């Protein structure tokens, strides 16, 4: 048993799905808006993801654009949500704010 | 009255790893790491990959980030450096006596717990054809490559630049092999100066006690011989002729060192006719045109090359080669005075003193010490095996060059330059 | 977002540009007081009397 | 006497954090630059000149 946590959680699948990236086929991490330290992350990923990334982005603009969805079946489940990205940023974030301490002293 | 001098400690530890220090007072302090992982170890799979390491001493550790190496070392003022030699690389670090602590935490990451990011070893994939730019700039460098390239057809035939069909293709992973497999216990010196013996050892205890590569300084180098030619057009050419000589340590190898001095190295009067330098003597009495000859003497593990070196006019080349070579004959056939070895073995005496009198050529020779001889060997001694060196012995390194099948390396317009076959 | 601007180089780079950044404003207000012809701070001054009754 | 530096000859590379790149040992010049007429490869895509954490007070 964890019953508030997954509601909690429930919540989350709930807001997912209101989203709708998922429809159009993206993940979490393709909706992020590219700041300075996301452009560096995505800089940073190996070629596989990369590839994977710039094709879900295309597909993704091209149903945008005959403002279209995916069939169901094909849509991004909440659970199968690769957070691919996050390692990279925190690891740019955690470099970042090392420079902004070493610039105080 | 000044200090009376410290003595050095010396320590090897159960599993292989060497410890020196010496409190020398001095305002400033030095460590070196030494590491039998020289370009030597390199394989015909992973060419440059001990370059781009070198290369590599301040990308990002666990325990230290990048930007933490630069700014930690650069706000106190000291320095990071890694010198690769055909056997050894060697990181060494400087800075005040007070802040030997940080350095050494530095030193530690660089050298045991290295990341090799992806994108940061992408990043510096182009430095190596600046580097390889910035040495092949001396005529030398590439001469020596090629010397040995042609010398020897196994490890000490690899060079200390990458080749560049390498460039780029050095992999992330390729680093993490050659430092697990290289920078082991057994394959490793400590060396302190400015440091006290329990700090060193007790860093060597907790941080260096690394074992699981490769055990055999000689992974062995098979002599060979031959030439390599390189058409350059090129002002004057550039020729080394060598001959197997004598593995560092040996008896043999401080007669090949007197055999130099004999010889000639570099010179001693700025702008000087060289009177003592026999080879310098010979060629210029049918030589009457710029010109530089030297007696050429290196020494490794299991292996030596000596013999001699030539800068000279395209056209002068075959004659400056043919006069030196001779030179070297009349050694060989009996031609050799007794105040001729004196006088040798007081420039050898007097440079080796010179060499260490310093802490960065100290540093250096108690590291190089350590890893060829798992030894420190006093100044004192190492002049008595000097003057054990005999006239018969320095002849018969001499006949040693002459009749050993050869190995030469040139550059230039090759025109007028010899072949081995014609020598 | 303001927190990185906070510690002792920027006390420092602060007490560095404030003679300046104080004789600059002494600079604006003489220009704005000249400018518009300030009476109310002008008539104070020992020699701009041009409002001469 | 084991260092490839103290039997002056055979190549050493160098690199470093804050200072230049050296090489080599000996190896002819020196004693090439005063028979004159050698003007040597200078600055055409090049590091510094001589190494500087020489000064003084």
Same mark, same amino acid.
């Given at each position: 048993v964890s019953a508030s946590s997954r509601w909690l959680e429930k919540i989350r699948?709930?807001?997912?799905?209101?989203?709708?990236?998922?429809?159009?086929?993206?993940?979490?991490?393709?909706?992020?808006?590219?700041?300075?330290?996301?452009?560096?992350?995505?800089?940073?990923?190996?070629?596989?993801?990369?590839?994977?990334?710039?094709?879900?982005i295309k597909r993704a603009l091209d149903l945008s654009m005959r403002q279209q969805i995916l069939p169901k079946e094909q849509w991004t489940k909440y659970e199968e949500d690769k957070s691919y990205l996050e390692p990279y940023l925190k690891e740019v974030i955690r470099e970042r704010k090392e420079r902004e301490e070493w610039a105080k002293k | 009255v000044p200090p009376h001098p410290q003595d050095l400690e010396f320590t090897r530890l159960p599993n292989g790893l060497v410890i020196a220090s010496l409190e020398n007072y001095a305002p400033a302090s030095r460590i070196g790491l030494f590491i039998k992982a020289g370009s030597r170890y390199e394989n015909s799979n992973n060419l440059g990959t001990s370059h781009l390491l070198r290369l590599a001493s301040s990308l990002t550790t666990k325990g230290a980030s990048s930007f933490k190496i630069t700014r930690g070392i650069e706000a106190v003022g000291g320095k990071l450096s890694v010198t690769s030699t055909r056997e050894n690389m060697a990181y060494t670090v400087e800075c005040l006596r007070d802040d030997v602590d940080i350095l050494m935490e530095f030193l530690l990451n660089v050298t045991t717990a290295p990341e090799f990011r992806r994108w940061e070893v992408a990043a510096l994939q182009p430095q190596l054809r600046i580097d390889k730019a910035v040495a092949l700039q001396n005529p030398q460098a590439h001469v020596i490559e090629n010397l040995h390239a042609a010398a020897?057809? +196994?490890?000490?035939?690899?060079?200390?630049?990458?080749?560049?069909?390498?460039?780029? %293709?050095?992999?992330?992973?390729?680093?993490?092999?050659?430092?697990? +497999?290289? !920078?082991?216990?057994?394959?490793?010196?400590?060396?302190?100066?400015?440091?006290?013996?329990?700090?060193? $050892?007790?860093?060597?205890?907790? !941080?260096? +006690?690394?074992?699981?590569?490769?055990?055999?300084?000689?992974? $062995?180098?098979?002599?060979? #011989? #031959?030439?390599?030619?390189?058409?350059?057009?090129?002002?004057?050419?550039?020729?080394?002729?060598?001959?197997?000589?004598? *593995?560092? #340590?040996?008896?043999?190898?401080?007669? !090949?060192?007197?055999?130099?001095?004999?010889?000639? *190295?570099?010179?001693?009067? %700025?702008? #000087?006719?060289? *009177?003592?330098?026999?080879?310098?003597?010979?060629?210029? $009495?049918?030589?009457?045109?710029? !010109?530089?000859?030297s007696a050429f003497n290196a020494s490794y593990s299991d292996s030596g090359l000596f013999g001699f070196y030539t800068i000279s006019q395209a056209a002068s080349a075959?004659?400056?080669? $043919?006069?030196?070579?001779?030179?070297?004959?009349?050694? *060989?056939?009996?031609?050799?005075?007794?105040?001729?070895?004196?006088?040798?073995?007081?420039?050898?005496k007097a440079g080796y003193l010179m060499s260490v009198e310093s802490s960065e050529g100290f540093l250096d020779e108690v590291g190089s010490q350590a890893l060829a001889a798992g030894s420190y060997t006093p100044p004192s001694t190492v002049l008595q095996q000097i003057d054990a060196v005999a006239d018969a012995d320095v002849i018969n390194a001499a006949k040693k060059f002459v009749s050993g099948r050869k190995s030469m390396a040139a550059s230039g317009n090759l025109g007028h330059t010899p072949f081995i076959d014609e020598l | 977002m303001l927190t990185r601007f906070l510690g002792p180089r920027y006390r420092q780079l602060a007490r560095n540009w404030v003679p300046t950044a104080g004789l600059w404003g002494a600079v604006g207000a003489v220009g704005l007081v000249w400018a518009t012809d300030w009476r109310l701070i002008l008539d104070w001054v020992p020699y701009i009397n041009g409002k001469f009754k | 006497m084991l260092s490839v530096a103290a039997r002056s000859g055979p190549f050493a590379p160098v690199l470093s954090a804050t200072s230049r790149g050296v090489a080599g040992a000996l190896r002819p010049l020196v004693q090439a630059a005063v028979p004159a007429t050698s003007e040597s490869p200078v600055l055409d895509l090049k590091r510094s000149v001589l190494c500087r954490e020489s000064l003084r007070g």
């Open positions: 699948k709930w807001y997912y799905n209101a989203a709708g990236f998922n429809k159009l086929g993206l993940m979490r991490d393709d909706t992020i808006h590219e700041n300075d330290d996301v452009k560096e992350a995505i800089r940073r990923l190996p070629e596989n993801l990369y590839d994977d990334r710039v094709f879900r | 020897y057809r +196994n490890a000490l035939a690899n060079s200390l630049y990458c080749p560049d069909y390498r460039i780029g %293709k050095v992999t992330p992973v390729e680093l993490h092999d050659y430092v697990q +497999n290289h !920078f082991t216990s057994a394959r490793m010196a400590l060396i302190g100066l400015g440091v006290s013996h329990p700090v060193l $050892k007790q860093v060597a205890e907790q !941080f260096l +006690n690394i074992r699981g590569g490769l055990g055999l300084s000689g992974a $062995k180098a098979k002599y060979h #011989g #031959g030439e390599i030619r390189e058409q350059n057009g090129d002002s004057l050419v550039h020729a080394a002729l060598v001959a197997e000589s004598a *593995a560092i #340590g040996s008896a043999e190898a401080n007669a !090949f060192s007197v055999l130099q001095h004999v010889l000639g *190295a570099g010179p001693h009067v %700025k702008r #000087g006719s060289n *009177a003592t330098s026999s080879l310098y003597q010979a060629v210029a $009495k049918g030589v009457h045109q710029p !010109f530089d000859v075959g004659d400056v080669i $043919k006069a030196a070579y001779n030179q070297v004959k009349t050694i *060989a056939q009996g031609n050799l005075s007794n105040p001729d070895v004196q006088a040798a073995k007081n420039k050898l | - | -």
